[PDB]
Amino acid sequence: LGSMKTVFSPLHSRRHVKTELDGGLLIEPHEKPSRAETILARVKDQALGEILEPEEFGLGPVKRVHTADYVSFLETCWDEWVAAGKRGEAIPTFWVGRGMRARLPKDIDGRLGYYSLGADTSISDGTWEAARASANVALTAQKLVAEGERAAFALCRPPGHHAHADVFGGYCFFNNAAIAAQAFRDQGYGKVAVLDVDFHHGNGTQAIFYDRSDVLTISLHGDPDLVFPHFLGFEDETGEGDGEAYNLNIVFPPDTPFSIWSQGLEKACERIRTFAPDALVVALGVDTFEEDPISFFKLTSGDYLKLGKRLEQLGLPTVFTMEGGYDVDAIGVNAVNVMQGFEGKS
């Protein structure tokens, strides 16, 4: 039936790190260029709709969400790391432990730790440019929807939803979904909802809008007691200040299938309807998949068609930002199934 436009960057390997700290070893990263290659190949093979490259928006709309100091650090981090004589990729070794001061130091190792929440997200040559391109992909999709499209697929790589205003991690650097939501707001959309269906909690998006009532943030995810990001995402985090009751976390345990997960989806859609937003950003991960190598939900490829159909029933202008999903064999089928389901495929 319907068609949906996809925005992508041709340089899938602009970010091309070779190490990820995992179980005490430095392994090949889970978040690989072939993730974007495979999704794009399936977008073309299914003729989802027009494919386009991103427009350059510059750092202005990125800085509506992220701090100036953080954006500067990501641009210079690799250069400074190399200049200090380190021989691996840029990985934090030390951080602000409990009892220490949240105080920005001068040394590159100190800044790396100050600005991170994990050691599994290496930085190297090209990472800065890749983060910038991924944010432009998100902003191009947002522009397409603002200028008339019902929906658009921002094929973001690297993902974004773990990044705070000034913290990177969980393979994320710029919070593409938050940048898209803030762009809707800046363009006069009074209220925006960001719905996070990636397997992991969107802690970055929660933190960015936590004290605000004009952006509703909702995430379904695996229990942070058991999985990343561990220290946010619990159901008692409902917002702060004016943002009280405008954040909603819905947690699930291991082996949760679509029959159960979709009940949380319905609760999220009901909260969205009450909020009555003017635009919707969906932070889409397919790491809820039953074969995902780092996650523990049990969705099947066919369930993603049902997910897309239910999201379309919200009846809102919708930007999809690509987040996680690490079984590369199925990542294209799974992600494009959501878009096809949104466009009417059953």
Distance CA 226, CA 234 (A): 11
For CA atoms 131, 296, 307, 342, give the dihedral sign: positive
Q: Under the criterion CB under 5 A, does residue 200 sit at the interface with Zn ion?
A: yes
**Is 211 in contact with 242 (CB distance < 8 Å)?**
yes
120 is in an annotated binding site: no
**Number of other residues whose CB lies within 10 A of the CB of residue 229:** 19
Return the closest-CA partner of residue 322 out of 133, 193, 155, 138: 155
Distance CA 269, CA 311 (A): 8
Q: How far is the CB of 111 from Mg ion (least distance, A)?
A: 9
Contact stretch for a second copy (CB under 8 A) within 35-43, 102-110, 240-248, 253-261: 102-110
CA geometry: angle at 221 spanning 216 and 226, to 5°? 135
Residue 164 designated active-site: no
Q: Using CB atoms, what's the residue nearest to ligand B3N?
A: 324
**Number of other residues whose CB lies within 10 A of the CB of residue 198:** 28
Catalytic choice (30, 66, 162, 164): 162
Q: Under the criterion CB under 5 A, does residue 228 sit at the interface with K ion?
A: no
Q: Under the criterion CB under 5 A, does residue 107 sit at the interface with Mg ion?
A: yes
Return the C-alpha torsion angle 175, 335, 229, 95, nearest 10: -50
166 is in an annotated binding site: no
Q: Under the criterion CB under 5 A, does residue 198 sit at the interface with K ion?
A: yes
Contact stretch for ligand B3N (CB under 6 A) within 143-151, 261-269, 286-294, 327-335: 286-294
Contact stretch for K ion (CB under 5 A) within 17-25, 236-244, 274-282, 304-312: 236-244
Distance CA 181, CA 213 (A): 13
Q: Which of 203, 205, 288, 337 is the binder for a second copy (CB under 8 A)?
A: 203
Q: How many residues bind ligand B3N (CB under 6 A)?
A: 16
Q: Which of 11, 16, 22, 214 is the binder for ligand B3N (CB under 6 A)?
A: 22
Return the closest-CA partner of residue 31 out of 11, 43, 13: 13
198 is in an annotated binding site: yes
For CA atoms 123, 9, 40, 176, give the dihedral sign: positive
Q: How far is the CB of 198 from ligand B3N (least distance, A)?
A: 4
Q: Under the criterion CB under 6 A, does residue 324 sit at the interface with ligand B3N?
A: yes
Q: Under the criterion CB under 6 A, does residue 287 sit at the interface with ligand B3N?
A: yes
66 is in an annotated binding site: no
Would you say how long the chain is, in residues? 346
Q: Which of 149, 198, 237, 312 is the binder for ligand B3N (CB under 6 A)?
A: 198
For CA atoms 313, 314, 317, 318, give the dihedral sign: negative
Q: How far is the CB of 58 from ligand B3N (least distance, A)?
A: 26
Q: Which of 39, 61, 73, 109 is the binder for a second copy (CB under 8 A)?
A: 109
What's the token pair of residue 220?
């379904």
Q: How far is the CB of 200 from Zn ion (least distance, A)?
A: 4
200 is in an annotated binding site: yes
Q: Which residues are annotated as a binding site for Zn(2+)?
A: 198, 200, 287
Catalytic residues: 162
User: Rule CB under 5 A: which residues touch Mg ion?
Assistant: 107, 109, 291, 329
